[PDB]
Amino acid sequence: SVAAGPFAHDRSSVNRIMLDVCLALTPATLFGLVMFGWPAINLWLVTCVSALAIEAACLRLLGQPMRRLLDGSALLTGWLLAISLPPWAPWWIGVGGSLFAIGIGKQLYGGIGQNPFNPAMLARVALLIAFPLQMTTWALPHPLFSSSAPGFFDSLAITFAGAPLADGMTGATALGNLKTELTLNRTAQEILEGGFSTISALFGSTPGSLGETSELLLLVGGVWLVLRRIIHWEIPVAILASVFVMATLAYLINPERYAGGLYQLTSGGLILCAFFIATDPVTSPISRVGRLIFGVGCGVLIYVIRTWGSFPEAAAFAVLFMNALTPLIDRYWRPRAYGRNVRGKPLVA
Amino acid sequence: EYVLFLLGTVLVHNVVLVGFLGLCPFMGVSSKLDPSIGLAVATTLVMGLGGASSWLLEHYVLLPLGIGFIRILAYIVVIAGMVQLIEMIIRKASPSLYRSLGIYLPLITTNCAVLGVPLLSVREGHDLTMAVLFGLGSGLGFSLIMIIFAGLRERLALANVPAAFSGPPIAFVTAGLLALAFMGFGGLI
Amino acid sequence: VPWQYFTSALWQYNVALVQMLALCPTLAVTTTATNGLGMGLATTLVLVMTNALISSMRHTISPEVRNPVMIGVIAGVVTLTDMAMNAWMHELYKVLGLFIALIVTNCAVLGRAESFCLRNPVIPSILDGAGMGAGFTAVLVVIGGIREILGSGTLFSQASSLLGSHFKWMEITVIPDFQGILLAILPPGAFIVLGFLLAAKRVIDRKRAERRQ
Amino acid sequence: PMVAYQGLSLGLVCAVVALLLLTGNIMTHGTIAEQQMQDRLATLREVLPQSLYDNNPLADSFKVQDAELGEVEVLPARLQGKLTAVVFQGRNIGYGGPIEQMMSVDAQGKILGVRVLTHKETPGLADKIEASRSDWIKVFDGLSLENTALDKWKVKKDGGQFDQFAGATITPRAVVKTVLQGLQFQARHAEQLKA
Amino acid sequence: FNLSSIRGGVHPAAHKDLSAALPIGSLPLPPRLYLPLRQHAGAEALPMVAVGDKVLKGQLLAFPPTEVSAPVHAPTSGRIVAIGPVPAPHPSGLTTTGIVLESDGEDRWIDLDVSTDPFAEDPLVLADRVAKAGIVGLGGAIFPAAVKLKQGTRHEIKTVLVNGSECEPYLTCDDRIMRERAEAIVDGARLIQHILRAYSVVIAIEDNKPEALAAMRAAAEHFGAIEVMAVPALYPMGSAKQLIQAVTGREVPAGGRSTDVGVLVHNAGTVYAIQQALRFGRPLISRVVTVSGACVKTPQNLDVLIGTPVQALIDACGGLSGDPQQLLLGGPMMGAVLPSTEVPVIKGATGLLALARHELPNKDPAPCIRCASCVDACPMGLTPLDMALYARADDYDGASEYGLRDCILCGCCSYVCPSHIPLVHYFQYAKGQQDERRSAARKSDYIKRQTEVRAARLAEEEAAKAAAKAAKEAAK
Amino acid sequence: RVSVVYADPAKPLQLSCKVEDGCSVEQAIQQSGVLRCCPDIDLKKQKVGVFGKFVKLDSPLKDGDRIEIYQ
Amino acid sequence: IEATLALTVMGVLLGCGLGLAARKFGVGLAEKLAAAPMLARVEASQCIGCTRCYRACPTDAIVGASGQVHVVLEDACTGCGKCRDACPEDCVLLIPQEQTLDTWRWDKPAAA
Ligand SMILES: CCCCCCCCCCCCCCCCCCCC(=O)O[C@H](COC(=O)CCCCCCCCCCCCCC)COP(=O)(O)OCCN
Ligand SMILES: CCCCCCCCCCCCO[C@@H]1O[C@H](CO)[C@@H](O[C@H]2O[C@H](CO)[C@@H](O)[C@H](O)[C@H]2O)[C@H](O)[C@H]1O
Ligand SMILES: CCCCCCCCCCCCO[C@@H]1O[C@H](CO)[C@@H](O[C@H]2O[C@H](CO)[C@@H](O)[C@H](O)[C@H]2O)[C@H](O)[C@H]1O
Ligand SMILES: CCCCCCCCCCCCO[C@@H]1O[C@H](CO)[C@@H](O[C@H]2O[C@H](CO)[C@@H](O)[C@H](O)[C@H]2O)[C@H](O)[C@H]1O
Ligand SMILES: CCCCCCCCCCCCO[C@@H]1O[C@H](CO)[C@@H](O[C@H]2O[C@H](CO)[C@@H](O)[C@H](O)[C@H]2O)[C@H](O)[C@H]1O
Ligand SMILES: CCCCCCCCCCCCO[C@@H]1O[C@H](CO)[C@@H](O[C@H]2O[C@H](CO)[C@@H](O)[C@H](O)[C@H]2O)[C@H](O)[C@H]1O
Ligand SMILES: CCCCCCCCCCCCO[C@@H]1O[C@H](CO)[C@@H](O[C@H]2O[C@H](CO)[C@@H](O)[C@H](O)[C@H]2O)[C@H](O)[C@H]1O
Ligand SMILES: CCCCCCCCCCCCO[C@@H]1O[C@H](CO)[C@@H](O[C@H]2O[C@H](CO)[C@@H](O)[C@H](O)[C@H]2O)[C@H](O)[C@H]1O
Ligand SMILES: CCCCCCCCCCCCO[C@@H]1O[C@H](CO)[C@@H](O[C@H]2O[C@H](CO)[C@@H](O)[C@H](O)[C@H]2O)[C@H](O)[C@H]1O
Ligand SMILES: Cc1cc2nc3c(=O)[nH]c(=O)nc-3n(C[C@H](O)[C@H](O)[C@H](O)COP(=O)(O)O)c2cc1C
Ligand SMILES: Cc1cc2nc3c(=O)[nH]c(=O)nc-3n(C[C@H](O)[C@H](O)[C@H](O)CO)c2cc1C
Ligand code: SF4
Ligand code: SF4
Ligand code: SF4
Ligand code: SF4
Ligand code: FES
């Protein structure tokens, strides 16, 4: 057997890409771990380790090389799922999420590069549908080493086993609170005047998911990813612009019922989804117009299901729907060739 | 409004993912995209015509005579006859047209959707316009789901799916995941 | 041998597992083992009666309007079954709902009526219908049992109120003190279970062929 | 193979089948109606004890037009020409849509039992309204508008006395509001409903 | 004019500074030369000499059988010893028909047929003069220059483009050929502009060759219409389809030649060969090759006679200073692995790279992650991932729909692939399979036509003979 | 437009050459250049045929003919 | 009864219409509808110019006539064997086609 060319390469690798994504996620992950305390650390470690172990088992069953474990595509899935989960969640929530993602969502279709849906978001949706009580309990920020957060073994009892969180440690967030108070015949202004501060919401000093809370360190990480040419700006720009424009229009039309702009941007996992999750290379279009369509659809779906839907946030549902729509976009928006028109016929000259 | 009704029929109340109607042709023909599009158009037209004919038969013949328990039989029989005509009339008048609608028409003579939708619409007590819109919306939802699933299966056919799951089983798993994804539209309309 | 059709229709040609038919009731009424068993029994009875009628009326059907005749011969029978189990099995009728009426369009029923009942005597058609019904019932029971065990832990629950007190011996409980995974009962849980059953069928067929070799 | 024969076959089939279907219908329609009536009685019996009523409750159905609820379906339970209980239905918007429940209030304002008939709340989070999973719906069993002023008829979130589900408060709000509206509606309409 | 911008492209490490310092060296005459009879594209030339014949430097050993071919001339005087099989510079290593010439060492020229005032004759005479000289387009495409010029004459040419933008890494032959022989290249460009009635010549060099640009500008400063342009330093820039877009701004229509947009592209070595052939009558006998790599003691450029074995070139440049992990005939991006050092040097040989282990990247193939970095780097604007997906599943017809027809095998796909996939290998395999199917279909059509014609002629002859015999017996 | 074939078992050659209409086998063979390929060809000694029939050097040939030189 | 007659009028009309249309104008099977070469070889001794191979060869593969001329094949052969039994001395030696440079194709990559 002879060797074919080319005999040059740019030293690129999948491991570098995945580890760079993890490094970008690192600062917001640390901010979330410090803010919520030890149970967040326990859940994060459990989710990541379970994801890696299940990936190794699935690779062993399928006969694939164990070196596929070293590219970090499973650690990244576990990381994103763990930072997408509530902070003070039980261990079995994380273990089941990792099992449902790495497994059905990824390894049952062949492995990396073969699945049609986002694994982490698939696991998140499955957990929310199957276990709605454990996925809707948001703990207030109890900073590490603050004399009010539970200790090490108390946090062990909180995460493993079933020690109750007592009283006064669980609060309501922003989106769900706004929707509930709107159902309480209060206009959209009084709810936000005395129950929402943009400065504290943008920094990340509010209850929420593990890494979703801070919409600034996530922005820094996404900007670093964009500059390093790992992701394309089309999807984040389109998602954020669509959400902001729709929110501003609805605020201008009916200010007493719709909240728009800064409130929508600095709430939920919109920035995390736009930068780190909606930009999944395997389940996103390979074109430019295709990526723009993907982003605009994601933003429109997110806003529509936020405002009029039955969920406080629909980043996962929007991402899954657009992952379903991806193949048609790929096959109907191919780039133009050389010496041919957009229809594929040879140029005339 | 009617746009809300149509969108709720297409997305919130999809006839396949939450209705489990017309799954055999849906799982059999969605391997390729062109047959999927052809069957989608054919089933949309057939469902609209069947809804209109079923409402006319129920509110002009069955109820005035007092025989309602017969409805099922009458329904399917009429639909069957209609389908045959819509095949044969388009197997001579326009031979070119017997490549996008005529070929797939025998598949939907008995589809469980062309009969499920009229029976569901009877219980809701829809009028003629509402019945026709219900049929058209269910057909549109079936068409959109079939097209999306055909695209997904075409992309999966060129992937490294394990030998124990390649084919129908991976299609069923993907359809379950698709239903899970569509589960986010609940309560919107 | 006439008994060959009954044995061969169980696994060699399974209606919902080999021919890829009758998927609507397979996926819809499967949240409990009792629902699957009742639907399978009703479909088996309808198949037997329709096959017998079609075969006894075999040399009377014109080729061009074969469908609207036989469909009628099916539809009326189905109607009677409806009007039967709406009157004396109302508890089971309220659970199945629309899919007891949607047996006329069941692809397996019409497929067996057309393919086999138009070129075989009455006894082979009856045996083929019984075999297809038994295979469909077995598939439904398996899928319903798996889904019910996953979603609730219990197996064959409320058999007494649905299928009569005589079947009270079938109510068993697996995994006591278990709240269950809610996703199995939901529509996302049906397609996945069916796909896994198909994969298991393929694997066991390959292994059986290897052992025979 | 002649145009006469296809029509004759497709007419004979539809004639024989129609005759059989009509015979089956005339055989089983009475049994079907009896089964439906028995199901209605079984649904009613879960809130109304047998000893309280003597006549048939689903025979003297009233229809009262109020100012808020609209038109109601009050079923009286008279022992000997005297009203002892009234059973009606209340509807109110919850989280996933309207919730329809049945209430049986005695002749003195005490509640004899509340059951929820139709709901589409999220399973596993707000499904305790059903009596088959929890006894929360059995809280309203001795209350009235006399021993409970217009301050305790709210969930504990709004400053009342009725418990709320862990992670689900809108559904308890809707149920409590429906119960309070039913009690106030009985209070407004005297005599016929009050006695 | 003004340079436009091409789409896609990569920036590999040039490695051009270790060999483009010393001037063009010379080779001692090797004992024997192996000249393959097919050093061009199209039909194979037919030998005219026998075993043992004495030939002079420049004798026409083989002549073209058809229009699309080129003759083979004897690089040096000697005696023919074999007309048989010789090793071929191919990855497979299979032999090919070729002559073996034993170098006498006298190196005596033949009586060449020189011209007189080349700027006096009609273009067809110059075209056939180029045809009878063996010019073969020393650019890699090894297409005959006479055919290209003749096709260019029929259309209207508005620009003659000298493709001096040497873009492959490690290769510096064009750089020296333009530093040292700018005057001859300019004269050849003027001769080509006379052959094809045109407006101007637009000689193009990459910006990473300041000395070549300075030499060319100094040489061509008084002739007017001659222009020197400095294209950017991008790898797929020397390709005709991309250089035409960079210079003119137009795109060559798919399935069409460069003359449609009125541009003719010639290499900086082919122009020099044309100038030599027209002015002095010298055929194509020797070219300039580059010996480079970390396993060669002194990388350099050598004026190599055609048919010289590779081992002579390796020995001339000091020698193998270590273990050469790969031997490539050309640049890393489009080169081929040499079987051994006994392989000769054809007219299309561009380099003799000896790449060590620390210069060759290590690759562990992995499943495609759909990063779409192939689409961003493809010069032709194709989707390499889809083509590889369809070629792996033996769906060549579906791969052609995604651009396999227009692929130029540049190698920009595998150079930017995170999961190291041999995309170019898949494309070459698919193109080979398509070519095999096409050849089989062509053979089937030809044999069916031959059978039809032979049967028809035999039947008509038999019928005519039978009729003639029947007429003969009637009068008997 | 005709073809010239050398049936030498060691090396069977086939070439195609365009000749003026009304030409002869001698002139067609001279134009085809088969003599320079094989100097051991004796046009007066070896057999020259058309489609398997021995022919004469100055015999006229038509379009589509196949001159063959063999033992 | 009007019901049986109104459901018989339908049964005769929908049958007569279908019959008229037919005269004038399985689910599984329905979806299926919708969805080493060799060359001859002649040695230098077994051929005596008996012209039998050219006589039995539909293709113009064998070239030559007369006797002691050593007729040889061409590239037009297809291995049909029409010349095998034709030769009394069994000169035809059909063999598989050998690999050459012009018939060399790249091999598929192993796996990923
Ligand atoms: C009380 C206990 C509860 C336990 C519940 C467990 C829940 C698990 C949920 C899914 C998580 C893991 C998903 C499986 C990962 C598959 C990875 C590939 C493995 C695979 O395909 O292996 C093949 C074996 O398949 C087979 O042979 C498939 C057998 C299927 C068994 C039947 C399962 C029915 C139940 C389905 C449950 C679905 C739950 C959904 C909510 C053979 O590999 P190959 O042939 O390619 O060879 C390759 C080398 N030679
Ligand atoms: C590195 C190994 C793998 C790591 C992953 C698995 C870790 C599992 C940790 C074991 C489970 C946690 O174990 C947890 O222990 C703590 C601290 O004693 C107990 O804590 C509780 O019970 C103890 C009884 O001794 C009380 O004194 C204490 O005040 C109370 O918090 C919890 O009831 C138990 O749930
Ligand atoms: C991929 C990593 C997966 C991490 C999985 C870690 C799971 C660990 C579960 C910890 C056990 C929780 O379940 C617990 O079991 C036992 C009862 O048998 C009791 O727990 C007690 O015993 C267990 C071991 O038996 C001790 O580890 C624990 O410290 C102690 O509190 C608690 O009543 C119950 O809460
Ligand atoms: C559908 C998508 C997700 C796939 C999920 C796959 C299954 C994951 C586990 C589902 C279990 C649900 O059932 C769940 O069982 C766990 C045990 O694990 C019980 O957990 C109980 O024991 C565990 C230790 O084992 C304690 O830590 C816990 O505090 C206690 O409640 C939960 O009270 C019950 O809710
Ligand atoms: C490497 C990246 C950087 C790593 C940073 C790690 C340190 C992070 C510490 C900040 C997190 C905790 O810090 C903060 O604590 C306070 C109480 O002390 C919490 O509680 C309160 O703080 C804010 C202050 O604006 C109040 O307005 C608000 O009512 C409430 O949220 C915050 O929600 C939490 O944000
Ligand atoms: C994100 C990238 C795309 C940017 C695109 C920008 C295009 C639109 C520009 C017009 C935007 C006007 O944006 C306007 O800003 C005001 C503050 O001035 C914000 O309004 C803000 O303060 C008001 C009260 O003062 C609050 O009630 C409101 O909830 C809060 O968002 C709104 O978001 C919007 O009403
Ligand atoms: C799927 C079922 C089998 C196919 C059904 C085809 C139609 C058959 C109709 C005849 C049914 C005979 O069934 C007969 O009905 C009686 C009621 O009279 C049932 O008797 C019992 O059934 C119900 C179930 O809803 C019990 O709750 C109740 O205590 C009792 O009435 C028995 O099950 C059987 O004795
Ligand atoms: C890589 C991932 C590794 C995952 C590791 C999974 C093993 C973890 C073992 C946890 C310990 C046992 O976990 C569980 O404990 C609870 C009490 O807490 C008991 O569980 C009990 O409730 C569960 C509810 O789902 C039911 O199975 C049953 O009613 C009973 O067993 C059992 O003891 C054991 O099922
Ligand atoms: C692909 C693009 C799709 C674009 C979709 C945009 C159209 C959807 C928004 C317009 C409809 C708003 O719909 C409005 O909102 C509520 C919930 O918020 C819907 O839903 C409401 O009613 C339904 C039925 O009773 C129940 O689910 C429940 O009571 C409540 O959710 C109502 O039907 C309507 O009052
Ligand atoms: C990827 C690629 C790179 C090429 N690089 C060069 C180059 O550097 N120099 C060159 O003269 N031709 C290059 N060519 C192709 C031809 O040699 C050139 O475009 C033109 O055809 C020269 O014609 P000639 O051989 O008649 O001179 C390249 C072709 C490809 C596909
Ligand atoms: C930019 C980027 C974003 C990613 N986002 C996700 C994600 O949201 N969920 C996930 O499971 N993997 C994610 N991955 C990992 C990888 O895309 C995933 O393993 C593929 O789905 C493999 O099937 C991401 C990787 C990159 C480089
Ligand atoms: S560069 Fe490689 S991994 Fe990226 S899309 Fe192309 S083939 Fe896939
Ligand atoms: S090899 Fe072909 S597909 Fe790849 S970059 Fe070059 S032209 Fe594009
Ligand atoms: S048949 Fe045999 S002997 Fe006769 S001519 Fe042909 S090869 Fe020669
Ligand atoms: S095998 Fe057939 S084609 Fe080939 S030489 Fe013999 S007869 Fe001719
Ligand atoms: S489509 Fe086949 S049973 Fe419904």
From TrEMBL, chain A:
Membrane topology summary: Multi-pass membrane protein
Cellular component, GO annotation: plasma membrane
GO biological process: electron transport chain; transmembrane transport
Subcellular location: Cell inner membrane
UniProt name for this protein: Ion-translocating oxidoreductase complex subunit D
EC category name: translocase
Role played: Part of a membrane-bound complex that couples electron transfer with translocation of ions across the membrane.
Binding site for riboflavin: 73, 77, 113, 115, 118, 120, 280
Record has Transmembrane helix as a keyword: yes
Superkingdom of the organism of origin: Bacteria
InterPro entries named in the record: NqrB/RnfD (IPR004338), RnfD_bac (IPR011303)
Subunit structure: The complex is composed of six subunits: RnfA, RnfB, RnfC, RnfD, RnfE and RnfG.
Transmembrane intervals: 17-38, 44-62, 69-85, 91-109, 121-140, 234-253, 259-277, 289-308, 314-333
Ligand binding (FMN): 173-176, 209, 269, 316
Modified residues (FMN phosphoryl threonine): 173
Keyword Cell membrane: yes
Organism: Azotobacter vinelandii (strain DJ / ATCC BAA-1303)
Family, as annotated: Belongs to the NqrB/RnfD family.
Enzyme Commission numbers on file: 7.-.-.-
Alphabetical list of PANTHER family matching this protein: ELECTRON TRANSPORT COMPLEX PROTEIN RNFD, ION-TRANSLOCATING OXIDOREDUCTASE COMPLEX SUBUNIT D
Keywords (A to Z) from UniProt: Cell inner membrane, Cell membrane, Electron transport, Flavoprotein, FMN, Membrane, Nucleotide-binding, Phosphoprotein, Translocase, Transmembrane, Transmembrane helix, Transport
Cofactor: FMN
Phylogenetic placement of the source organism: Bacteria, Pseudomonadati, Pseudomonadota, Gammaproteobacteria, Pseudomonadales
From TrEMBL, chain D:
GO molecular function (one): electron transfer activity
Transmembrane annotation, as ranges: 3-22
Entry membrane topology: Single-pass membrane protein
Keywords from the UniProt entry: Cell inner membrane, Cell membrane, Electron transport, Flavoprotein, FMN, Membrane, Nucleotide-binding, Phosphoprotein, Translocase, Transmembrane, Transmembrane helix, Transport
GO process annotations (BP): electron transport chain
UniProt key word Translocase: yes
Enzyme Commission number: 7.-.-.-
Catalytic EC class: translocase
Pfam families: FMN_bind
FMN phosphoryl threonine, modified sites: 169
Superkingdom of origin: Bacteria
SMART domains in alphabetical order: FMN_bind
One GO CC term on file: plasma membrane
NCBIfam families: PRK01908.1, rnfG
Protein family according to the UniProt entry: Belongs to the RnfG family.
HAMAP family: RsxG_RnfG (MF_00479)
Subunit structure: The complex is composed of six subunits: RnfA, RnfB, RnfC, RnfD, RnfE and RnfG.
Physiological role: Part of a membrane-bound complex that couples electron transfer with translocation of ions across the membrane.
Identification of the protein by name: Ion-translocating oxidoreductase complex subunit G
Annotated source species: Azotobacter vinelandii (strain DJ / ATCC BAA-1303)
TrEMBL record, chain E:
Residues the record lists as binding FMN 1: 139, 163, 267, 270
Alphabetized NCBIfam families for the sequence: PRK05035.1, rnfC
GO CC annotations on file: plasma membrane
Protein name per UniProt: Ion-translocating oxidoreductase complex subunit C
EC number: 7.-.-.-
InterPro entries: 4Fe4S_Fe-S-bd, 4Fe4S_Fe_S_CS, Ion_transpt_RnfC/RsxC, Nuo51_FMN-bd, Nuo51_FMN-bd_sf, RnfC_N, Soluble_ligand-bd
Chief location of this protein within or outside the cell: membrane
Amino-acid positions noted as binding [4Fe-4S] cluster 1 in the UniProt annotation, renumbered to this chain: 368, 371, 374, 417
Species for this entry: Azotobacter vinelandii (strain DJ / ATCC BAA-1303)
From TrEMBL, chain G:
Cofactor(s) demanded: [4Fe-4S] cluster
Subunit structure: The complex is composed of six subunits: RnfA, RnfB, RnfC, RnfD, RnfE and RnfG.
Gene3D superfamilies hit by this protein: 3.30.70.20, Electron transport complex subunit B, putative Fe-S cluster
Protein name, entry field: Ion-translocating oxidoreductase complex subunit B
The organism of origin for this protein: Azotobacter vinelandii (strain DJ / ATCC BAA-1303)
Residues reported to bind [4Fe-4S] cluster 1: 47, 50, 53, 87
Entry keyword annotation includes Membrane: yes
The gene coding this protein: rnfB1
GO CC annotations on file: plasma membrane
